[PDB]
């Protein structure tokens, strides 16, 4: 009976919430990795600029 | 950039909030339907 559908729809909503949470987590991890390398390339660029100071 | 990526995680959070509210509404429906089912069963086994 309709309890099957209710249980199925409940599980699907949970699956979607989890997929959305996983997408959020991946974006956060991507931003953290990009921030790390942005910081290292910024460091490299600054270091090159400082060389010219006599 | 700053404003654009800001909106993407916000979009994800908005989606999750909507799905959470859909679950709570579905739970209310489940409660209503279960009440009918139990009343019906008790009537038939009385």
Curated annotation (Swiss-Prot), chain A:
Annotated region described as MPER, given as residue ranges: 33-54
Annotated glycan sites: 8, 45
Annotated compartments: Virion membrane; Host cell membrane; Host endosome membrane
Membrane topology value: Single-pass type I membrane protein
Any coiled-coil regions, as ranges: 4-38
Quaternary structure note: The mature envelope protein (Env) consists of a homotrimer of non-covalently associated gp120-gp41 heterodimers. The resulting complex protrudes from the virus surface as a spike. There seems to be as few as 10 spikes on the average virion.
Function field: Acts as a class I viral fusion protein. Under the current model, the protein has at least 3 conformational states: pre-fusion native state, pre-hairpin intermediate state, and post-fusion hairpin state. During fusion of viral and target intracellular membranes, the coiled coil regions (heptad repeats) assume a trimer-of-hairpins structure, positioning the fusion peptide in close proximity to the C-terminal region of the ectodomain. The formation of this structure appears to drive apposition and subsequent fusion of viral and target cell membranes.
Protein name as it appears in the record: Transmembrane protein gp41
Parent sequence residues shown: 630 to 683 of 856
